[PDB]
Amino acid sequence: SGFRKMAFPSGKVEGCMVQVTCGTTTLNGLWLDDVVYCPRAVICTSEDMLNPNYEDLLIRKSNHNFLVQAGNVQLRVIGHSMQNCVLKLKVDTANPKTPKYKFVRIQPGQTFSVLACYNGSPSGVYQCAMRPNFTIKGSFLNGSCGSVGFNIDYDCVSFCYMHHMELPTGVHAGTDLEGNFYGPFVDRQTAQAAGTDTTITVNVLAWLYAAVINGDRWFLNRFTTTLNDFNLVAMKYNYEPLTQDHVDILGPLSAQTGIAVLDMCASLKELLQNGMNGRTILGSALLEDEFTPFDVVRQCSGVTFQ
Amino acid sequence: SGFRKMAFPSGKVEGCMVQVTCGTTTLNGLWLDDVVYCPRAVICTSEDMLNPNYEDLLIRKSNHNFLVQAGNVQLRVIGHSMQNCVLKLKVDTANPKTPKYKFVRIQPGQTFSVLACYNGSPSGVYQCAMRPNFTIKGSFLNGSCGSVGFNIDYDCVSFCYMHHMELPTGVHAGTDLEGNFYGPFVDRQTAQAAGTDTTITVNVLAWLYAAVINGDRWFLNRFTTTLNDFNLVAMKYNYEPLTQDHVDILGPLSAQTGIAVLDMCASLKELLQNGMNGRTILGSALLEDEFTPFDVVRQCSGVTFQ
Amino acid sequence: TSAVLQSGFR
Amino acid sequence: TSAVLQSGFR
């Protein structure tokens, strides 16, 4: 029993974190095989950051202008190239701790674990979701740039996020591991703002199913709803439209609990209209939307507390 | 910016997790140097669990009655002994991944990271607090017994919790790494219940300071309070009494924000009396009490967003 | 109900 | 305000 914001064990990623320094600018890199991946922002100084031309800044660099440190060992850079907003630094040593890995670009509403890192040293791990507006509500300070987000499946680390910047609202923006930003953001210190965000409806429903699995049914009701009638209510509360694909993805959780997906939607509609009445669900007074249906199946018992 | 339930990087602990099997009963062990630590509940079968005599059950066992597996390598047990409610299994191989470590018995209200494990395989990491009633609100299924809780400081892992059981309220009970339970619980499947719990006041105050550090002041007021006048309000809301030691521990956070400790108590008193008025603090609609003052300093900027 | 020792089966 | 590239100083 119980239900926590649960991150993946971070050890396979900790073994890949290095420090990349160009001049006085330092950040984190990801050392996989003989390549170190880091944000291209490492080649800027404070006077370059409002509108850097990275192609022009990079051609002025040599391999020996990049200092890469893994713990206390220094890694020699023998080649470099820019791909989108990441640098790929070829080093003379393959990382012996390289896990089985993939690079994945996730959809909004998906979750991942973040290994917050400073000066190449992991400091903490927490769970995040990619918001519908393609920001994440992380916890990052200066020096965190290059920290990575990931999921793990059968000892394969799927890297999906590399951290770059903080927006004026205190939320965070970054790239996939090929250097493509999530959302419309660019890696320069300009007026940028996260677009209006919405609540991840399919995740809220998955979390309601988790509450039922763990033994709580107070929020259910005897009603049902059509998918269209639900979305007209969801839209007025700034919830994402629920699609038939979302309904199918909630299939396994609906089967385990005996609660039809559209019946849980009727429960959610009532929670949105009535509030919680000073009650909690899985220890939260708000509707939680950063657990995917996969996250619930991974953590919850396969046996419902009936 | 941002503020998350942040666990310690788990890699140093992942390298220590093994599987311990006695007959048909299996659970997790902690492999440090040439010793494997696990709950003594591993030597019981379903017919023994209501009132086992562990001393009588253990003398009927030989070293070869214990099967220890680290990944796929089998470790040979060359000695065994019981200490309180843990078994110490001497194995023929010292763990080459043994981190620098300590065993610590924590006070209630302290936090730690939990590496949830099944069949010796880490499955997830999350942050917990030791409740004032000496339970933890973990997330554990059958097979999790032997999972450990820990803190890390300068590459030293301080193990403070080994998981044993789930109480009828769905909260969890376990031991320090010497096998002494936290709270009045015993490792047998009997009528046991967590005592009445309270809210960790010093942690709520630390979290209010974190909210100020990150730029939010809406909940402050112009009042102050005496320590005694605060506790008379705190007691009626089931909050722990705040002591002068707690006031001193909040010293650094009070200095960084310029908010006297007793002034934040007056803010908390008003929040308890008035509620939140449909507002949130650091993304929560409830007062959060599972961040220590140390947790806040470790995660937050040293520079207040003024 | 009773406390549950959360050992596994094998 | 402006976005902030959260690199470190050394």
Numbering used by the authors:
A (entry chain A), B (entry chain A): 1 to 306
C (entry chain C), D (entry chain C): 1 to 10
What do the authors of the reporting publication say about this deposited model?
Mpro is a cysteine protease that cleaves at no less than 11 sites on the replicase polyproteins. Initially, Mpro releases itself from the polyproteins through autocleavage. Then the mature Mpro forms a functional homodimer and transcleaves pp1a and pp1ab. Given its essential role in the viral life cycle and the absence of closely related homologs in the human genome, Mpro is considered an attractive target for anti-CoV drug development (12–14).
Further, we solved the structures of SARS-CoV-2 Mpro mutant (H41A) in complex with six cleavage substrates from replicase polyproteins. Substrate selectivity is revealed using structures of the H41A mutant in complex with six individual native cleavage substrates. We demonstrate that the subpockets (S1, S1′, S2, and S4) which are endowed with an exceptional selectivity are important for selective and potent binding.
